[model samples]
Target: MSAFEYNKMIGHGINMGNALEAPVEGSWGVYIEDEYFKIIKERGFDSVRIPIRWSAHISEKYPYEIDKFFLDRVKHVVDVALKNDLVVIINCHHFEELYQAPDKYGPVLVEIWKQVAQAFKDYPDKLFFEIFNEPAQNLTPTKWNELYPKVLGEIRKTNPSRIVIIDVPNWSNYSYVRELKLVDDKNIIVSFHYYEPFNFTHQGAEWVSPTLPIGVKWEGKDWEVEQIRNHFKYVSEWAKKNNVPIFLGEFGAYSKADMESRVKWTKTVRRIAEEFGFSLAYWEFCAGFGLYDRWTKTWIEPLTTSALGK
Candidate 1:
């Protein structure tokens, strides 16, 4: 289950499950308790992505020292996912301090990865590594072009050939992806998260502004074919031209939509992804856009079936 053989149709990253808040403590205890693995496996998904926030565990000021308990806790979740035969990806999700650029960011990132490398030194490659969830928007493509390789040069020093995932600026936008330079190795994979027409995907998240009105076409239900096609156009050209595969690290509609619309969105996302040979994982397993039932302590039946024709 390496990226080299990533799913042509089904691969999903479970965002922030083992992050600042655990799924067990959140809206869906069933998911963190490992019951959701059966559901994910049953759904034919080949991977489960875990995004862990490292800053919370780190001591304040300068070089961050992560607490051992936090690392162990995250490893425990990885153990469960692996037991279920799912490829697990563990990454430095949202750091406590700012992480938007390369000037000082590059060295700080390298220091962070050094600790990360040491922590997972013994594990096999089944568990993947992502440098940062979304590098700060302040970092320019030219900066990442210089910064990423410098960071990767250090990472490669210890974990050479490790299939690391990298993201572009402005929340991993596809347009950003096109402007960056590729790493010297093929073991690298590019990642971006999509939540186009944020109104639908982030219904209850109040922090967002200019949300869609109720009953509007959220997440492309109302998108013109050209608009959707253009989004993929940016992503596809980057991946194809660079000869790299794109992995949609996160995307989903909130539970704001009824079950029917939710399933349709899921199927529609898959259709577009298949068209571009991209792989993905939904934003979450619980809470805002979750299928796992926390209170009921069970996995919800998938709204729509897999294997839909693209």
Candidate 2:
């Protein structure tokens, strides 16, 4: 089994705005600069997945206006990734609960995909488009399946065979994968996030909703683990049967846990991804879940190197 041609895949991700936001002045925002790409490439990661909250950079409301300056900023980052000779994956992130995707968000969701598709119309297969973040729980599988195809149809109009990534429902619950009724598109892959039981991964995370309580860890003994395993089992089986690919589009545990345990979990996940032939991109770069020294502008070599078994 391999990730995109029998290659052991390694990728890291970045949330564009939050990491690039005007914070810590020079020390912080540089994560979005060329130097950041240099650090990522030097670390031996093969690809970069960029999560963009386009609405924040857009204006008014859904079907609102997308400004040229904002579009340029997005392109600048993508260009930087390409210049580094790294494969780039760009997706609409964190917009589901807000303006672009939630119910009554207008025809904004479709427009969002159209804008993204048109913007990157010239990009080839190396660039991938993720339709939306986690569509809210209120949307049922039937509804989600319907909307996904509808918007994807628009995206395909301008971007035929560009390898788009489509995520499943209920905030990427692994079990959600079982319900997906596959739509035909040879270039597309299914994306499901893994944050199984926020206790361990989300401890001390101030930004998380319902604030995941501290000290929880996964030992692969609970029903949740069984659920995850079963989901992967099914998806992997289906993938093999259908001759398709899958991706863990987002998965990362917070820094609150002991570093050693974090590495252990990461390695375990790598094994799972390898077993199933799935490509992966962790949830974020710096912004807390990262293995970089925001102070030195260099990677926290020991931590990342350890997880990578480097």
Candidate 3:
């Protein structure tokens, strides 16, 4: 299938975050539920991006194999999502060792992908493998450009036609898109995350340093919209020039922001991203930047509608 066709299959998506990616299952306070997949499909999302820290669950010895039980649990989640008819994107997330020392961990990354590719080789096209999540720190763009192809090669050995997602370095920041070197493969999609005007999107975010002051808001300022439009325009130009598809893999404001501000910003971001012919997945499903309330089993009102472009 062409990249355009893949985009249609991934029209709108949500990240099943804080579950598999956590250092320990449910460490982030959310557990994957089969019912949650049904709800996501019924609520209009066409895809789910599952972030997993494969390195964390793997043996430390030679071969560095992923634990069979963990692998089975992940497959169960993927099967549930597929049964609900949602395209699934799984990636190596929070592999801090790789980010902190790519030269040391590059082989490990490649080995993990080799196993991942083999494990899902029989799966249908709806399943995608994102090489890594936001390569950064010691893994510079130049290094990522070099490492990605090797990882892709590992995957191609088992699943040559499986769609693979690639991201620019610098934490998949939109500004770094132009810095990426194009690969020879045609079945790949370029991805980046968006949380621009950081003061607003990450205000009160516990994870960010020098905490942004609370009360910073996105109130439809021309600069904010212009900022988003200009960035995506650059990305669209690059996508067209390179004949590659784009995936706005993660974008959403934090819960610390008021509901009104979050909804408005999300609507604008989703609208512009789709307008640029890019597939999108909200930053997350139900922690911090969430669209659903796990406790109530209900969609978060205006935020959910805005994300669906209501």
Candidate 4:
């Protein structure tokens, strides 16, 4: 299938965030219960993006072999998603060492992907590989752009036609799209994460330095909506010009934002992403930016509806 066709298959995904990506599974307060896949599918989601912290589970010495237990855990999660008939996208998420010193950890990243590719070589095409997530810090755009294909090449050595998703560097900032050099393969999707007007989306986000205040609001006024439109529209043009499919792999307003504004912001971004003919996933399943309420075991009302139109 063309990249566009594969993206259509990956439409309307939810990132299984804070689980495997939380430095330690369950440390972030969510575990990949098999039933989670069932629930996601039941809600009519077409895919799940599993963000994983492989570096946390791999060796410290040369070769950097991933722990057998962790590998099986990932495979089990992937199997559940696939069995539920949902497309799966897994990635090297939160590999902090790589971001801090790509020169030193670049080989380890390559080894991780090569092992990952070889392990899942026989998995059906419904399972896709995302090269890396939200590259930032010391991993400069040029370094990231130069580094990913080396990882891609390693994956291709085992699974030649398997579609892979490549994120834009600088934390998947859409504006950085122009910096990426396209590989000479059609089976790749360009991805970016959108949390524009960051002050609003990240209101009260504790992890952010200086801590964003708790009360910022996105009214979705004419200017606000138009700015969102401009972002996806400009990036869509790039995708069209390059003849590559684009995926808005993550976007959502945090809980600290007013629910009304959150809904408006979420719906506006989702609508615009769809308008640009890009595939999208909500930022998370059941955490700060969650669509489902794990404690209540219920969909988070309009937020879920806002994202899925259901």
- Best-fitting candidate, scored by lDDT: 4
lDDT of 4 by residue, 110-222 (tens): 99998999999999999999999988889888888889889998999999998899998889988888887888978999999999989999999999998989788889899
How does residue 123 of candidate 4 score in lDDT?
Answer: 100
- Misplaced by over 4 Å in model 3 are none
lDDT of 1 by residue, 1-310 (tens): 4444643323544553533443223333323666566666665667777766565666655686767887777777778777888777777666534454457556776777888787776776766777777765666666767777876777777787767888866678666776767876777788888776566556655556755455644344456445656787788887877787788888777767666656666667767876788877776765666655567865455642422221
Which residue pairs come into collision in candidate 3? none
C-alpha-based local distance difference test score of model 1 = 0.66
Model 1: lDDT of residue 164? 80
Clash count of each predicted structure: 5, 0, 0, 0
Model 1, residue 249: what's the lDDT? 86
Give a tens-digit lDDT track for model 3, residues 52-160: 9999998887688999999999999989999999999999999989988899899999999989889999998999999999999899999999999999999999998
How would you encode candidate 2's per-residue C-alpha lDDT over 70-139 as one tens digit per residue? 6887788888887877778777665644433445552566787788789899985567787776765656
Worst 10 residues of 2 by lDDT: 1-10
- Winner of 1 and 3 under TM-score: 3
